[PDB]
Each structure stands twice: as C-alpha cells, then as structure tokens.
Amino acid sequence: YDRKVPSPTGEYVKEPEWVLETDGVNLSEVMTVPGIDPTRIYTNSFIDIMEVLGIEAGRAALYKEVYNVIASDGSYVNYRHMALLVDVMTTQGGLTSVTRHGFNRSNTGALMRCSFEETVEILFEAGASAELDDCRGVSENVILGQMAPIGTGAFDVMIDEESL
C-alpha cells in the first residue's frame, strides 16, 4: 500500500509499506504478535474491535464500515448522517442493531402506531408496568388530536402583551 506521510522537509510524500490481509479473524491474538504495529491493526469486524478495543473504538470502526459501503459506489453522504446512526447504535455501551431488533418498537410509544393486529396485548403490559408515554411521536399525537412536538410543533405560540 502507498502511504501518505510527512517527508523530512514537511510536505506529504508516498511511502510504500507491506500490509497483511487475512481470511479469518482473531484480533486479540494477532495483535500480540511481535514485529507488527498493534497501534494500527484493524478488522472489518467491528464487533471484535468493540470487545477488544472498547465501545469508543467500536464506534469508529462501525463508522468506517458504513462509510466504505457507501463510498464503494463513489457516493457521498455528509458525515453527520452516518455519525448519527453510528451513535444511536452505540449509546448504550454496546452495538445495537437497527434492523428491527425488538419484537416491540424501536423507540416508539404504546399509544403510537397500532402495530400488530393486537395492540391490546401491548396495552396490558404497559398497564402492568406503569409505562409512561412522553407523547412526542406523530401517531400518538394524532390519536390525541394534537400536533407532534416536532419541527414546527417543537415550541408553543402565545399572545404577547408588551407590544404597545
């Protein structure tokens, strides 16, 4: 691989380096092998990076992976959108999937979208658990006949008594 490095004079120059790509992964152990650079080892398995290098490291790999999948077709997406997704997937100190993990919701409310032919069963559990609906979703606010606290509804408008 050609590597962009600062030349002794300051300007970046390409310096070739031998790199090893492997079929199979055992990060914890290969990393320990002498003669390599443990500081720069990597793997497309973000899961192993997480269990071995920590959540934060995991987040960065999870990002690099998503990024490549898109940069693969020469496409571009502002960093903030993939960064957002990667953060959601990492907030709880673990790697939570986005593809309908929970058999119930993702981050919705009981009174929200009448998912499943039986919303009643979801209501029973809510009752037996003292579930508290914040009422920030659209559907839940629809049933309540109100606009959701989103964008244009993220604030209230009141008459002013100062203007002479």
Binding to other proteins, residues 58-97 (CB under 8 A): 60-61, 78-81, 83-85, 87-88, 90-94
CB-based contacts of 144, cutoff 8 Å, min separation 6: 111, 135
Pair of tokens at residue 107: 């981050």
Residue 119 binds to other proteins (criterion: CB under 8 A): yes
Among 15, 17, 26, 32, binds other proteins (CB under 8 A): 32
Q: Report, in Å, the least distance between residue 113 CB and other proteins.
A: 8
Q: Count interface residues toward other proteins (CB under 8 A).
A: 95
Contact residue for other proteins among 47, 48, 65, 148 (CB under 8 A): 148
2 DSSP β-pair partners: 16
Q: Should residue 44 be labelled a site residue for other proteins when binding is judged by CB under 8 A?
A: no
Find the binder of other proteins among 54, 69, 70, 71 (CB under 8 A).
54
20 binds other proteins (CB under 8 A): no
Cβ nearer to other proteins, comparing 47 with 52: 52
Q: Which two tokens stand for residue 110?
A: 């009981």
| Given 45, 48, 57, 65, the residue binding other proteins (CB under 8 A) | 57
Q: Which residues contact 58 (CB under 8 A, 6 or more apart)?
A: 46, 47, 49, 50, 90, 95
d(CA 3, CA 13): 8
Residue 22 beta carbon to other proteins: minimum distance, rounded to whole angstroms: 18
SS (H, E, C) 7-45: CCCCCEEEEECCCCCCCCCCHHHHCCCCCCCCCCCCCCC
